[PDB]
C-alpha cells in the first residue's frame, strides 16, 4: 500500500538520523529503504482506470 509504504519509509529515515546503528544494520536498512522507494513510485504510475455501469 502506498500510504503504508510511505509511512514505513518515513521511519527508515528517522532511525538513520538518530545515528546509533552499526554499519551492517545501516547498509541493510538503506537497501530496505531505497528498494521500497522505487517499488512505491512504480506502483503509482502503473495502475489505470476501471469503470462499469448499472
Amino acid at each position: 500500500s502506498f500510504e503504508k509504504a510511505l509511512s514505513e519509509l518515513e521511519q527508515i529515515v528517522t532511525r538513520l538520523e538518530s545515528g546509533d546503528l552499526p554499519l551492517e544494520e545501516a547498509l541493510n536498512e538503506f537497501e530496505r529503504g531505497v528498494q521500497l522507494a522505487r517499488q512505491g513510485q512504480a506502483k503509482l504510475q502503473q495502475a489505470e482506470q476501471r469503470v462499469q455501469i448499472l
Partner: protein, 50 residues
C-alpha cells in the same frame, strides 16, 4: 462545474509523486552525512596511530 466536482473528490497524483521523490532525497542525503561522520572518526584514530 462538473469538472470542479472531480477536483474536490479526487487526490492529486503529481503531488504524491513529488512527495515520494522528496523523501528519497532526504534518505539519500542522510547516508552521506552518516558515512562521513564514521569515516572521519576512523581517519583521526588512524592518524594518531601513525
Amino acid at each position: 462545474t462538473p469538472s470542479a466536482a472531480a477536483e474536490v473528490v479526487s487526490r492529486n497524483q503529481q503531488e504524491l509523486l513529488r512527495q515520494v521523490q522528496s523523501t528519497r532525497q532526504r534518505l539519500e542525503m542522510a547516508m552521506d552525512y552518516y558515512l562521513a561522520n564514521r569515516t572521519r572518526r576512523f581517519t583521526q584514530i588512524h592518524h594518531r596511530l601513525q
